[model samples]
Target: QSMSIIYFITTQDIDTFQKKLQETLFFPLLFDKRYAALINTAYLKLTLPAECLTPEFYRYLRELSLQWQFDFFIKPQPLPANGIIAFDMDSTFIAEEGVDEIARELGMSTQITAITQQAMEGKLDFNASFTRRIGMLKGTPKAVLNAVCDRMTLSPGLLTILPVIKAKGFKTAIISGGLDIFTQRLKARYQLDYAFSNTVEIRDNVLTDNITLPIMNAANKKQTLVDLAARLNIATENIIACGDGANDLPMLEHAGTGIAWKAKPVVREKIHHQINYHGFELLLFLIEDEL
Candidate 1:
């Protein structure tokens, strides 16, 4: 029996979209006879026989529209289970840049901002860039670091998404280049399955600014996901990872569904599944039917 092929239409050229889509899915593209021609971002047509639009399609489309702002105009096929969700903390979940917040407390905001920009733009490696930035914050009091975390705020739609995601019985984890303090708070608040982040080095109650422990970089984030999957006995296909910077690309590349949420242009252009048009809830669209 032949399976139906449903086409996912986007505004870009099919070739370009295919490349981006592959990166997002973290899988090789299958050149099945399922997809028809692209129609200039009009309607993405599916080569599926009429039988493919089962009762499940309605739920899939409705969820997609609600989450991603995808409508009838831009066609999308039903994606199977996205059983686990991974989030990057600094920008994707929280509104403020963590390092900048801490830097401001130390009166080094101006200096740290430049390095942050380079790292996010994929120019500077995170650990090296972080080392240089933190050196400027040397001698900052530990109290100053706590103050920054207290001052930080999560992005809009964050509070609402957690309970809903948890209720669905999907595993949730946070993999961040930010501080462990903030990630631990989120893990407790949301009852998440796991949280991994970098710890700040403190000496005699003062900020060392230098990381005593290994920094959380793209490779670490990727490895964490693999670790989580093994611990839970879940396959990699069950993971859904989301992030916003260049350092996040590795995790994005490793997960089953990689989302670049309100990310830099380079990321949005390269990643497969993206959410520039909607809220965090857009994730629901990818796994609605499974729930």
Candidate 2:
């Protein structure tokens, strides 16, 4: 008869564990829901053939737990198929922490960085806090900001997985707290179906330290998901969203399948099926059965 099992792990080393586990398992393990605590945990529902035993699955869980410092608890249930996929810009899809990079350029790194931490910790309003932060760069040179963009790098495995997922007919979008520069750059490269972010203020090719453009924060991120679903004529349950910060929580929570990709503790705590330590290529594991 079918059985249920669960495990807990505590190591921050998800990369090593995922690679080793993939070699042993034939199919991907789906995370049904995640509970955030001191350490994050994923609650999985697995349907095994009748012959499978509880102890056998438990053994595997134990092994997985050994690699990490957390435990897992598994139960038998169904794993849903995901449709749309949304992403956060900075750190999630790109290596550069965009805001920090900008702060560095203006030598306001100390003050701006503090606010960034507060925003990520859910202590402040992303839009208002970001506006204040951007205001500090009023006189920053436009060329300096553009230079930061030139140095930004997309996340690992993004290039390979972009087309692969798109070819499967899944919708793609970016919901970011970063400047529009990065998203615009990727839009041209990946042809994203939807993209939204705060606009940086520029005056006569110079930095105005004032954001003439509107801010796209947590609420905007959430609305973008709903808007995309409506435009695509798909149910919210057909969508998949990925992100890595507190500002992303609103959007991620609204998506059908919210994935936290090597996210912050707050983000990972709330999301299971996280992409921690997994390369962007592994996102292909989320595709529908047909494509």
Candidate 3:
């Protein structure tokens, strides 16, 4: 028989949570005290037998968790021995949208961003906006492009968690619709297992607007996760793909855990998993029990 792992996150104390959990389910709920102390954000994980998690119990648990302002996840088993965590770099590590930043640098902020306003556009239509938007960046000075790169900053808790997860043997990947110029640099810097991105070619110290055909559209993001999982011999359910855009939908749904990190409301509505609360602090769940 398989065991179920219920991940719980809240700012409340563990003893306080234990009281609430006991009130909800009488079975012996176990938590790793070691993790409790290690988690600076209070990710108190509770383990329960799969047999005890009836639909009714889950429903009640949801209500209880929401009442306590907590996040909960129930998985059939622990994360696979060698899982992957794929990130959409735009909103995951770096703070702002790199595309818009490039536009802002070139005095085309609203002009480039406005192109996305046609009812939020669809995954099929990513090429329409990107081609038009990136086309405007053609021949932009590489020094100016480097200026935008220099302004990039990683979100909170990323540096701390990335090393732990990597050390734990989790293969990490950064798949972005943004230019490979930025994402590829991260691959080398972070020692990421793999990286995929669109080519915003540059030549002779100037940007080349010739976006490589077959852009990193929504489906491409999803397909890469599938292909990578197959190539790595890992289960899709063993992967975690996180992003914050309309284009992120496909990969989000494709992963066993597709988390929308402060995504558009439309994107968030589609994917049940989300990360609007803590920046990257809560991502520690990926390596919670492993240590």
Candidate 4:
């Protein structure tokens, strides 16, 4: 049998979601719907056969999730009890897209963010987008960059879940496309297990707009996940990744469980597991039992 967990955003809408769920072809295959209190609130859980996960079924699920804002996480049977939960830092770990915040500081949101929009939209590749975006940052003062990070807030449910997950001994890492300057501090503050990110060069406390060698594209992101798994003594399929952009697809797809957390339409369309309505806390709720 295929084991799946369908996490609803709110208990109030569950009856409505359930009414619609029964209308599907796979509805009959699911076991009894059980409501559980995860962390604090209620979520619907059901088990079903793996065969029901046909392409058509997935298509239906995509529509269902987008329409209802539910997380239909199709998890492995045993579940990953002890493994790293990797995250993309910019939007997944933090509330804002890191680059966009920097652009806001520059007083030219449109100028810097067009590249970000296109990168997320897939009109331009991530490496090219980063280069173009950073190129415009030439001569930015160090204070501005630090201030950008200072103003950034942790995503809701972040502080709540971090200690809980870390205490459970589930390793955590921030493998991000954002620059190392921001991620390194986050890693230290949170005591995260690992951090892999791109770097930008600074000279005389001002932005040189020079990207250090080996820009972090999707391939690099996937590699970081792969390298961590081998080094951490965990299987690649034991990793859990969450991200909110197209650049994160490679790593998210590679991990055992990948969640698109309030992700872009392009990302949501591809990744099956998603958390659209809630914050990062839902992740603990989704996999609470496994821990």
Candidate 5:
């Protein structure tokens, strides 16, 4: 099957859009314009010569996407949507980071936020950063954790996409470096098939300053995706993984369609699809034709 470039924009200034495409020397042999009301975006499909489908070409397009504040993907002609769609919990599914919120409750937000930024950008190691951040909240009351969960908000488009994903028979799961307490809540709330995360040791309504052994870090996230695919009898190429942090790199690269959802620069540059200005519903547009 022929490969194609799929571009999505919330709104467009035709002159600028065309000018930019011209500068990039991307002249579409064919164009398919699609509108997805759920996401309020225009999905434009373009076909180019096979030679123009290189990584460098897509990299440049991503540059223009960032410049113009749009989103896009490059995939096989009839985009596949036959497997799992795994997501990282914090920032990808929910609007707020659970640990960061816990830090806020403990008056340690600044320290934890800095660590989170470094970890997501690939500057700091995920396990170490998580350990240090959780350590800061060691003595926090267990009730505070529940309070943070109560304040957690779903990312834009998540609510709209869940029903569509369910109806499509795609197994959805969340592999987070956050905590199981919250990931489980999300699983139940969305009726997801699986959820994985680290467990914090709590004793008598207070944190124990110790996390469960074998923290669910980046490697575990990737392995879980692989395991889930095997258990579901699906191929690795049939999986779709979405996340916004450096820790999500492993699984994102392992899946067939890896999406960087409003991700950091390092992650955005590596992933096949990126949705910077929209929400999870942008994914619905990617598979709109298939539907």
Candidate 6:
């Protein structure tokens, strides 16, 4: 198989970009106009000379990604179609973190957000932080969940990619540390095949300061991805996982392609792909032909 470097550029100034590449790159590159039109983004493909495939060369390109405001990935020519794409709910699939929205409704936004930041940075234990955050939300009216869900927004490119993937026989799922109350709604709306999340305990129309056992933390998220792949009879390499937090690292690492969607620095450094400037729709560009 041949190796190729795929570039996704967000800049409209393609002329300047071409000049920069001409001056800086060691290997020759080709502009893929067909894919550029298909995904509505500027695309470039390069066949790396054997010497240019080293870690130092990749590191140099990573720096260039920052300078050019673009994302690039190296893969075997003709990237394979993913059989499954699992997403993290908060900040990956959706714009708002459901718990944070709930906290905002209850006047505990500051306290909850502080813990949330730590958790996403991988500095705090997710289970403990989750319990503390939810504890502050005790007595919050169950109705608040619906109000928050109503305000939720799907990440950019989700709608464009969902229908196309579904038509291609690709399975979609949400493996979130977030609550089922929100994930269930997203699953139904997107017609996704699977959804796994923590269950918030509520009674008498109020929260009980407790969540379901075996909270869906990083470990559970990874397990859910593995289980889903097994059930669908798909290879782990054909699974694509997208997330933006520390809790998502495990699942991202387990899948064939792990995308850090405008993620925390810790996550971006470890994942297989990182998209900083574009929305979820940028993914469609990566596998345009398959879709």
lDDT per residue for candidate 2 within 1-291, as digits (tens), equals 254333223344454544555466552243232333212233233334544544565565545543553443332233224357888998888877876888887778899988878976789876778787877777767688778877888898778788867777787888887777667777676788778787775678876655545567688889878887887787776677888888888888887667787788887667665665545665544552311
Residue-pair clash count for candidate 3: 0
Q: What local lDDT score does residue 260 receive in model 1, on the 0 to 100 scale?
A: 86
Candidate 5, run of 10 with poorest lDDT: 1-10
Model 5, runs deviating above 4 Å: 3-5, 13-28, 37-40, 110-125
Per-residue CA lDDT of model 5 for 1-291, tens digit only, reads 444555656467644565556666633466566556765665666666677777777777777777877776666444546678898999898988888788777788888888878976889887888888888877777677877898899999888898888777788899999887788888997798889889887888888767887889888899989988999998766788999988899989998888998887789778768888877887775555552
Q: Which rank order by TM-score, best down to worst?
A: 6, 5, 4, 3, 2, 1
The pairs that clash in candidate 4 are 2-50
Q: Which candidate is the best by TM-score?
A: 6
**Candidate 4 vs. true structure, TM-score:** 0.85
TM, every model: 0.70, 0.72, 0.84, 0.85, 0.87, 0.90
Worst 10 residues of 4 by lDDT: 25-34
Instruction: Answer with 1 or 2, whichever has the higher TM-score.
Output: 2
Candidate 4 local lDDT, 1-291, one digit each (tens): 444554445544666666677676334444344544445545556566566667888787778666665665555555665788999998789888787788887887999877778976779886899889888888888888888888888988888788777766689999987877789888997899888888888899988877877888888999988988888898766688999988899999998888888899888888877887777777775446642
Local distance difference test, each candidate: 0.67, 0.66, 0.76, 0.77, 0.78, 0.78
Which residue pairs does candidate 6 place in steric collision? 157-281
lDDT: the better of candidates 1 and 4 = 4
Off-target runs (Cα >4 Å) in candidate 4 are: 1-9, 13-20, 23-38, 114-125
The TM-score measured for candidate 1 stands at 0.70
- For model 6, residues 1-291, the per-residue Cα lDDT tens digits are 344555546564666666677688734456553344544555555554555677777777777888877876665234547588899999999988898888888888899989978976889887989898988888877688878888899999788778766766678899998877789988997799889899888789988877998899899999989988998898877788999998899999988888999899888788758888877667664455532
